[PDB]
Design a protein around this ligand. Sequence first.
Ligand code: WBJ
Ligand code: WBJ
Lengths: 427, 428
Amino acid sequence: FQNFETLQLHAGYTPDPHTRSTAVPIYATSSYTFNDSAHGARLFGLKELGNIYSRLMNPTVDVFEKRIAALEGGIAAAATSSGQAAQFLTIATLAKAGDNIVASSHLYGGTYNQLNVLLPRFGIKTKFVRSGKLEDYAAAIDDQTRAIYVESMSNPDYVVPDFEGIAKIAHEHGIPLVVDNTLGAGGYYIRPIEHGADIVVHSATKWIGGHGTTIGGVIVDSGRFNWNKHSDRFPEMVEPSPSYHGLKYWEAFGPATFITRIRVEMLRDIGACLSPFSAQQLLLGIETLGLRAERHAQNTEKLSKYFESSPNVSWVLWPGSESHPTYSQAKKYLTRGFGAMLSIGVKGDASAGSKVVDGLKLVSNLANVGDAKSLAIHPWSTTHEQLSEDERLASGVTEDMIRISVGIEHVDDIIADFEQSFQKAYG
Amino acid sequence: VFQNFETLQLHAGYTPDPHTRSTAVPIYATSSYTFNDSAHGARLFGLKELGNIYSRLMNPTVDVFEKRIAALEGGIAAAATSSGQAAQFLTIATLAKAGDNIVASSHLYGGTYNQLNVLLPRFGIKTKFVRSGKLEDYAAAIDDQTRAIYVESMSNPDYVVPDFEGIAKIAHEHGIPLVVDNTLGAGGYYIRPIEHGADIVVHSATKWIGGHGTTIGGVIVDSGRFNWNKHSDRFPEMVEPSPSYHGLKYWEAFGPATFITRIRVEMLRDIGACLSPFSAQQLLLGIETLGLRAERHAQNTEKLSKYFESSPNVSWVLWPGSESHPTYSQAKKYLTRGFGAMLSIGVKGDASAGSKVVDGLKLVSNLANVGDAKSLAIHPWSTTHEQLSEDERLASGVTEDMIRISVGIEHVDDIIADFEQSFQKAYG
Ligand SMILES: C=C/C(=N\Cc1c(COP(=O)(O)O)cnc(C)c1O)C(=O)O
Ligand SMILES: C=C/C(=N\Cc1c(COP(=O)(O)O)cnc(C)c1O)C(=O)O
């Protein structure tokens, strides 16, 4: 099947012949009993594929991994306990002390802090690029570079990168392109592997889960980056491995080498694993991902038209807008809806934004995106609080910005909620 | 304020909320927590007010799990993680950075040894291993870049018990904390290392704490007893203006809670190895019977060691309650509520015999875990310690003839009977 709406219900699971359970069971088990002692030794020796221990694999999580990989067009995936952990495990596999990665400066505030503050005390530095220009990405690469890292639509100014031009630069220098596709809704709005991304990461907490119940992340491997070809930057992908008695990953696993290392090195030793309970919550969300993402983007388009005519709004920021700075990229890469987000500024002083948010009765003020319920937050004092004012500006965040995650409520009710709040704030 | 472990494991850290009056701990399957207003959200994010923000960082179900474990161990506070490995990783990553080292015992669970010997050096954090257990070797390995001494309260799978008070004395005299993995101490039932000088205790909650083999999880417990200010030369991030929080000075704001606070507002926030509330609820169900289970585990282990000691089919028994145990003097001193839930044996004959004995068991399960209510057996040489070199396995007490047994709470006569019938089959 290659329709998204079909894969999100069927990919990665067949009822086992023992129980024939139609729905995916929740394998609430830490462990898996060996057939015999020799079988256990083959499992720990990576000589036979099979369930060993839920810090590394779990059959509920396996369905979640296979289904997200199918939706994104990757070969395989690995779940983590959060979007933050998905990014951390990915960079930790590609880079070590003395390496760097090149990243867009337009990031979720928590990713910016991860790259700018946390990773450097492990020896891993980031060179940020603000302009989006191909030549500035090229000029930032040096011999210690291990990836280019961008968000598919930055949180919360919705910069769409030139995926194909950046992938070309990355690949000419022998480094992978890593894309955080959280705001791409599990591949529905944007499938970065189709435009050159080698590795895709998600906070599954957001549109993938869809209901604000569960934290989770996932790492998708395209299988398309020839590590052996570029083993001067990635020796651990081909050289004998100190943690598996000289196993050579590329020779053993080929295009699955990166995602194999994520599991047998990083999940095994860092241990940021996903619960099967969490995975089942996320699978329920995935079963309607296409439907929700479609309605989200329809409501977002309609709500932006309302905001564009509202005398109470000073500006609307929406990647579907012909005024958007990267509208030419949005137009090329987003052909199934221009996302589920918009940001606005409202008229008046510094006080006005908080007054409009606080007066909403349907929209919830909290930290999340991609709930079925509509959400609002002030990134300058929350999601991007840890950044300096200059860093906020380099990420498109300003003191007057209100970030809106548009839900699937009836759009007349969303609009009516803003209307009554505007009339309490302004008359 | 309660005295007894048995009472704390049911009541510490939870009072029914007055909205619902729910007697049992609810499962807060929520990513987020709605602000009262915009200014409230700003105070939460600015760390100006205590309150729920987002479940990568805090969650009310996980919070009960955390407080209850802290109360059982005698710490001021705890932070849950997605696994025992993650509890270790986040702890060392807070204390140390690239260019630093820690000193650790060489008697470790194989996954920890590989974490310290292979993973962390990639981040420029190296470990100096001490094989002897002697106080003077721990002292000698400390240099100016050392950031901790790390030991298991009873090592997996040879059950070395460390001289807690002597090692703690060395650590504190050099201005570094003592970090103890108390996994095999069963949540503080068998051993409470904070009472003996440990500054920080980590657990795999996957084991006796959860007790049913359903759930992976970890937890970090801060004693609150290490003075980060006295030793800001080795730990400047504990006192110096913080780049994550606009110059916040942690010690000056949080005092004895500084380490556990950084674990949350730096490591869980940016590494994100959080525990789900569904997992915390499974673990809370286990904790409600931890003292009862640990008591029966140890009672069954004592009786099973008696059985193996009189069996013609056993070459040796390894049990920290044995007067022949290399660290029996430390076990007797620090284990006064039962000598653990574990033993290891070697069986007579050639190399294939341990394998046939385990394969012949029909009640005991051959799998990777410890601290299930069900009895378990495994061959660590080819499993839990498979990643280590042979010399590294010896230095951790693992032999090729070792069978590790996690003794369950089944009726001990059924456990003995299972080994007996498997012994006839293997040996006639
Ligand atoms: C409250 C968190 C928010 N965003 C999280 C996020 C993450 C991290 O994922 P988690 O660790 O939270 O699962 C990664 N990438 C992007 C694009 C993100 O927006 C938000 O509301 O802005
Ligand atoms: C299958 C795993 C086993 N042990 C795990 C373990 C860990 C890691 O914790 P998790 O990441 O597994 O929660 C930490 N410390 C000790 C002492 C441990 O024994 C085992 O069966 O030997």
